Amino acid sequence: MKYIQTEQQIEVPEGVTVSIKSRIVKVVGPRGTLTKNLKHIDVTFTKVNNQLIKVAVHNGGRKHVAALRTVKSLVDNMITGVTKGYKYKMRYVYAHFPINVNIVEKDGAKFIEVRNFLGDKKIRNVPVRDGVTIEFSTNVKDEIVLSGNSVEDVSQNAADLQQICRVRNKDIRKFLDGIYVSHKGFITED
RNA sequence: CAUUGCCGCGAAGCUACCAUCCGCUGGAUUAUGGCUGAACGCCUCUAAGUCAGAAUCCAUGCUAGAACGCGGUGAUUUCU
Ligand SMILES: [Mg+2]
Ligand SMILES: [Mg+2]
Ligand SMILES: [Mg+2]
Ligand SMILES: [Mg+2]
Ligand SMILES: [Mg+2]
Ligand SMILES: [Mg+2]
Ligand SMILES: [Mg+2]
Ligand SMILES: [Mg+2]
Ligand SMILES: [Mg+2]
Ligand SMILES: [Mg+2]
Ligand SMILES: [Mg+2]
Ligand SMILES: [Mg+2]
Ligand SMILES: [Mg+2]
Ligand SMILES: [Mg+2]
Ligand SMILES: [Mg+2]
């Protein structure tokens, strides 16, 4: 159809500074800073009143309009991550062999290492990405908490830890053993 | 001499899964599973973006070296 003008609102809270040179977005709030290259979308950012940023598509088809709300969600995730952060909580699900998840140093490269997953002799290793903080819960058993500003990094590192512990050659409606995301929320939220 | 007369052993050379030795590790992916995430206020692996991933592919490595692809370097002729 080629809609003439489609436009999304982006609400900036008070402690957040957003600098958008051409389509490279830098979001600087209290937790730190984040940058996203958006030069694959062809949208137009503008600033209204230092708390509101419009993003708009002009003469855009159905898919080009679809990518605009995606752009709004990406910049909102940047703002939410540098204001509140993200916190993904995973649980260890096992039947007989207790999954042993430790965090270890190998040449300064900060690995999560998983032992005894279904009684395996194979040590699994998931590198902690930059920004992601790993800690282990107290008073909640079998809980590993991945935290950070970047929801991309926290979610992908939690997904790496889930995919590294998938069951081979067994009925997986019965062999449920694994590490699973149980909670997605924020670092500092109430 | 017997068209290497025949028989035993026989160095050398050649040779045998009939003897030994040796046969590399990185990147990008397919299927598939995912992440973030709209379209479609929800959802969704997908549309933009993105992670992992096969005896695959491309490298590394191994063979040849364009006789019309190239480089560097040594010497370049008289009592002729
Ligand atoms: Mg599997
Ligand atoms: Mg079976
Ligand atoms: Mg005679
Ligand atoms: Mg005769
Ligand atoms: Mg004789
Ligand atoms: Mg005889
Ligand atoms: Mg031979
Ligand atoms: Mg090699
Ligand atoms: Mg895929
Ligand atoms: Mg996709
Ligand atoms: Mg895509
Ligand atoms: Mg994205
Ligand atoms: Mg990959
Ligand atoms: Mg030649
Ligand atoms: Mg020369």
Side-chain angles (χ1 to χ4, degrees), chain A residues 35-124:
Chain A
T35 318
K36 193 167 267 286
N37 185 291
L38 289 194
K39 278 170 96 79
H40 48 94
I41 309 285
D42 291 331
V43 292
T44 289
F45 287 102
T46 194
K47 163 184 171 180
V48 167
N49 55 13
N50 210 7
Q51 294 89 47
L52 183 63
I53 282 155
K54 313 301 217 65
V55 57
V57 176
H58 300 97
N59 201 45
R62 173 159 174 87
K63 289 293 173 63
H64 197 187
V65 167
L68 169 76
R69 179 73 208 191
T70 309
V71 161
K72 181 214 177 317
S73 305
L74 288 185
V75 189
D76 279 355
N77 284 349
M78 288 169 89
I79 283 155
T80 287
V82 67
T83 296
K84 295 184 284 186
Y86 286 91
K87 165 167 290 164
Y88 282 25
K89 295 185 186 68
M90 318 194 77
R91 306 299 307 280
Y92 309 159
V93 170
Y94 48 86
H96 184 264
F97 302 102
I99 297 155
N100 283 316
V101 177
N102 274 14
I103 190 166
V104 76
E105 288 297 314
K106 292 181 181 180
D107 285 276
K110 198 79 171 83
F111 285 85
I112 307 149
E113 62 87 20
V114 173
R115 309 175 96 91
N116 213 38
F117 169 76
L118 279 149
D120 274 28
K121 291 301 131 185
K122 181 176 100 72
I123 297 89
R124 288 148 166 87

